[PDB]
Amino acid sequence: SHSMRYFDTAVSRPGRGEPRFISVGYVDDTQFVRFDSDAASPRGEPRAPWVEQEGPEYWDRETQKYKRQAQADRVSLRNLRGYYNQSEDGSHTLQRMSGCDLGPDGRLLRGYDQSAYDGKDYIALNEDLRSWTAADTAAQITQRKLEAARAAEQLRAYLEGTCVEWLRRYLENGKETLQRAEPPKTHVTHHPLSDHEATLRCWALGFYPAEITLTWQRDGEDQTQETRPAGDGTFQKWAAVVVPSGQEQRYTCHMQHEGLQEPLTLSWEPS
Amino acid sequence: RKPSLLAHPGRLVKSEETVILQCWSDVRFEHFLLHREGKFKDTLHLIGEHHVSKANFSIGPMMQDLAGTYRCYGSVTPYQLSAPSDPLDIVITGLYEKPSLSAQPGPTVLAGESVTLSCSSRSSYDMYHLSREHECRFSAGPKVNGTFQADFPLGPATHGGTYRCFGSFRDSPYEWSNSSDPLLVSVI
């Protein structure tokens, strides 16, 4: 349950002009970096007070990487818009997800580098971090240009080690923000669905992290089994259940969270 | 008139490297500007300095979006631009697995003998380019033992020097690979 996920998007405008590039980084559930090509002077901005403590050469090297990948993605938009013979009419999108999921030990479990063009998957790095999967022939041209560069070797070195090492370093540095929990502030709503039907919603608001278990229980057993950003780094998740109207005293919402020692039982008290 | 563009130290540029496009003219322009045509066009304004007049345009660090065809213009004060200088095709290299550069029958040869240079790579390059004795452009055969090869029979133009060659794809004639191991041909 530990991951470093980078999300990149480059949108090509119709005609001449730099396609706008943007890239955000998440450690677990927290956004901690961001870059935007279309600033007055584009550079890499922090998004949490626990990466501000990183040295000058860190932010310098990071920013340089972001710039080179920006130009690389704009050129990629040009070439791709040349691979399907699509004239100046049309604004396009290019997305890339690059991240790593840590294992039960201090070493890598999963490496991701996916690339999608205008919504559909385009080219992806295979799970062995050595092969590729292409969606069509154009992505096979891309596959040749990428194998000629040996980006799978570079990337395998990045995911295996650098992504993991710096994941551990970010966890350690930010254990006062990431490895701490926030208990949820609760409330239960009730809406009439039909004549004999009524819907109950178990709202858990302002909590960290995202891992939360919401179960509706009728007397006894389970009945059931999304989240949205609260805006301050926390989340909101509601658990719905459809019950016969006039029988809501029996159904109770049990709730398990990291910040909760004992689970919470929550019945509809309309007061 | 036209201005005079040239490259320093050369028209080929490795990645993460900066070049100096020098645009000089005898007209004593007080302003200069440098335009790149290619995948992404651009213009750069700069001041003219009277050493002859000239401007030194610092390009870099070179990346795929900075290669292309370059033309500089001179002006006074507002702008009153000149006719374009001769174009100059700045090329980005150092992006892919370097090809191999073999020689036939060998690197050094007897005086009165011809040499053929062969560029071969497991990477599936469309074209191969050859310098310098930076002009030679040939295409690549599809497969032998999984490798892609181009052959430059130098025939009557073999005088020796250091030779490097690059691989390139057809959609990007300005994006070239790493330099091959530079091979010195001597006419022993």
Partner: peptide
């Protein structure tokens, strides 16, 4: 940190 700078696709 961020992925290394790679070539254009």
């Amino acid at each position: 940190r961020y992925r290394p700078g790679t070539v254009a696709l």
